DNA sequence: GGATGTATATATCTGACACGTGCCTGGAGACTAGGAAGTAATCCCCTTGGCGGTTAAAACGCGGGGGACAGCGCGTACGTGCGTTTAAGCGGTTGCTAGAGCTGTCTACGACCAATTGAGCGGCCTCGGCACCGGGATTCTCCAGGGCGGC
């Protein structure tokens, strides 16, 4: 029953344990030097199931 | 009618300008060597913007009492003024010596350059001491047998 539409992150925060199941689109506003940080950022929403 | 106040003219004093001279120090011209600017490479420290977790320091609030400050009294010690003394200030004597300045001579001492080598910096191997692991000696807790009591 969430009225939230957009969820903002700093890219390197939260660790690997953030579940962001309900979201669908990921906007990388600023790219990282390390591509694994952006891969983890995309995998916040691209989880199993 | 006599003497006093005031204006203009002339001689003298004094700071400033220019002339003269020495001399010595700064400027002009030429040559040379090296100090510093520039270049390339390598490596380590600093910058900016973040994240995560610990934790002790910082912040905030509140009660209370110690200390800052104000007021008052008092007595003493310092200011003030005057008369007296005294020593500072100035001018002066009289010689000798210290010291600045200048000139002159010379000699020992320090700059400079080439060759050498031995003391300073870095790494490597070893010892002194501290620590990890295995074995022997000493002391503590426990399980079972013997004897006694009850129905």
């Amino acid at each position: 029953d969430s009225n939230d539409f957009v969820f903002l992150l700093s890219t390197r925060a939260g660790g690997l344990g953030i579940n962001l199941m309900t979201a669908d689109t990921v906007v990388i506003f600023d790219s990282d030097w390390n591509p694994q940080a952006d891969l983890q950022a995309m995998a916040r929403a691209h989880r199993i199931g």
Side-chain angles (χ1 to χ4, degrees), chain A residues 2-49:
Chain A
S2 53
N3 50 350
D4 299 320
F5 167 66
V6 60
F7 184 74
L8 311 170
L9 282 302
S10 68
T11 318
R12 288 190 174 272
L16 282 72
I18 297 192
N19 194 58
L20 280 171
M21 207 84 206
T22 57
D24 200 14
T25 317
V26 170
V27 174
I28 308 294
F29 202 89
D30 308 324
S31 280
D32 208 314
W33 290 108
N34 195 8
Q36 305 311 301
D38 293 313
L39 269 168
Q40 289 169 8
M42 293 182 286
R44 293 230 199 278
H46 195 237
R47 311 190 70 88
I48 289 186

